[PDB]
Design a binder for this molecule. Structure first.
Ligand SMILES: CN1CCN(S(=O)(=O)c2ccc3c(c2)S(=O)(=O)N[C@@H](C2CCCC2)C3)CC1
Ligand SMILES: CN1CCN(S(=O)(=O)c2ccc3c(c2)S(=O)(=O)N[C@@H](C2CCCC2)C3)CC1
Ligand SMILES: N[C@@H](CCC(=O)O)C(=O)O
Ligand SMILES: N[C@@H](CCC(=O)O)C(=O)O
Lengths: 258, 263
């Protein structure tokens, strides 16, 4: 029957269409992952229903209860059959769910308000005037918590105890804070989202330095799901036909910034 | 059920796998050095197995003969049960994914253009709109298949030309392509992966360079025979090494740390 797809409202991957309130079903959404889902579904020959993840989180495991939340949790507990969104492939997640080869590449990066005197992660670590944080329940936060790299280790030690909290519930709130903090707050987010933001009004944000790591997003399915194989082959076909590149160019590259 | 030495197939391709100086008096795995030599050691340590490095017999990556339907190169070694795992710059592709297993990528790359410094060429577009400068790719690899299969105008145009060019514009090894670029006084441009291109750009006599953006985006993956029990473990090993930052360290080690062109 119908494949239940869990995804998340994150621009430009999944966004509510203008006048969505009178729309219904899958027609309510638009974005990179909306088009991707349609392409995958066609190649694998299945019907699907897009659903926004209940708690609006990507996926993290509670150290105490050891329960998974976000989209990872919905796959693990059988609430969804597949996840098509900017879900990062990580070791801890790979041990509980299946992932296709990556359909998009990215790396943790730094977002600053134009003019901020910061050029790297190291610069941030050696000062305290400018505050910096990350998104909660995501791979970026986990990256800093787990790093044994001096600089990142130092940055984590600071972030985890900073008051007020430097962590945000959503990417949009992280961006908002950078823009509204007169340069006293830098945000650590993935390059894909960073580059999308610096492309639009009011064109006051900027990505500085190189990415801290190199990785990618993958389409996830419950461990052992029979859907996995077909989806992986589909991702590779779309990659080779150059369709994944076309979708990126479509949803990312305006002119209201210069 | 007893553990036995894992047979690793790989290819002599710098800086992934190279003959160590004094190799003529060394034996086994000690005869080699390189990015994939270090990677194989890391993977083995993490997966807890012993291994034997074996240079692929025909010196090819892997392609299937349209008529006999037989696979050659490293892919053939895995498919026909000659090797237990492949650790080398083997590109993850659809046709290969259909016959063998691949871990998540351990290195990213894209098809690129290598030119002799000074050559008046900035893109694949430039190459397709002229005939003074010849150009080609490596045989039996993903790059040649890319042009053969492209439905994109400019790439289709390049393939129509390359496939019929005389003398042949294709080479059997990367080394042969590099020498052709270096000796053709700017009359030959070579299409190869960004990884190999960037490595050579750091090698003496520093007379070549990468131009334009990459034509595509993909990566190399560690391969195993389809259904092999070794696959799960090595994939997790690749992700761990990735997150510990080791992979980035190895890239810098063999590519830039000791480049011979300064900077
Ligand atoms: C310069 N940019 C590089 C990244 N690409 S991209 O749209 O993010 C893209 C497109 C296709 C693929 C990737 C990224 S990827 O993350 O490197 N994964 C590849 C696959 C294809 C072979 C197995 C890895 C497909 C856009 C252009
Ligand atoms: C700026 N360079 C980018 C490429 N890296 S790299 O050494 O080739 C490298 C290192 C680790 C990984 C890659 C590439 S990758 O091809 O994008 N694959 C990633 C994995 C990690 C999550 C699943 C994809 C690991 C070196 C630095
Ligand atoms: N893509 C991340 C969320 C964003 C972030 O952590 O920066 C994840 O899958 O957890
Ligand atoms: N990495 C390629 C070989 C090099 C090339 O085709 O340019 C392959 O696995 O086929």
């Amino acid at each position: 029957k119908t494949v239940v797809v869990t995804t998340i409202l994150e621009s430009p991957y999944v966004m509510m269409k203008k006048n969505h309130e009178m729309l219904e079903g899958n027609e309510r959404y638009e974005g990179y992952c909306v088009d991707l889902a349609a392409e995958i579904a066609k190649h694998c020959g299945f019907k699907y229903k897009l659903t926004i993840v209940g708690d609006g989180k990507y996926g993290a495991r509670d150290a105490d209860t050891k329960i998974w939340n976000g989209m990872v949790g919905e796959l693990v507990y059988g609430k969804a059959d597949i996840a098509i969104a900017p879900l990062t492939i990580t070791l801890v997640r790979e041990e509980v769910i299946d992932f296709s080869k990556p359909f998009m590449s990215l790396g943790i990066s730094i977002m600053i308000k134009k003019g901020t005197p910061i050029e790297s992660a190291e610069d941030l670590s050696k000062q305290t005037e400018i505050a910096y944080g990350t998104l909660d329940s995501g791979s970026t936060k986990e990256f800093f918590r787990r790093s044994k790299i001096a600089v990142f280790d130092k940055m984590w030690t600071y972030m985890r105890s900073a008051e007020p909290s430097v962590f945000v519930r959503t990417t949009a709130e992280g961006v908002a804070r950078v823009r509204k903090s007169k340069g006293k707050y830098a945000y650590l987010l993935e390059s894909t989202m960073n580059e999308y933001i610096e492309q639009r009004k009011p064109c006051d944000t900027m990505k500085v330095g190189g990415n801290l790591d190199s990785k990618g997003y993958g389409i996830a399915t419950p461990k052992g799901s029979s859907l996995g194989n077909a989806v992986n082959l589909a991702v590779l076909k779309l990659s080779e036909q150059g369709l994944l590149d076309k979708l990126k160019n479509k949803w990312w590259y305006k002119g209201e910034c210069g």
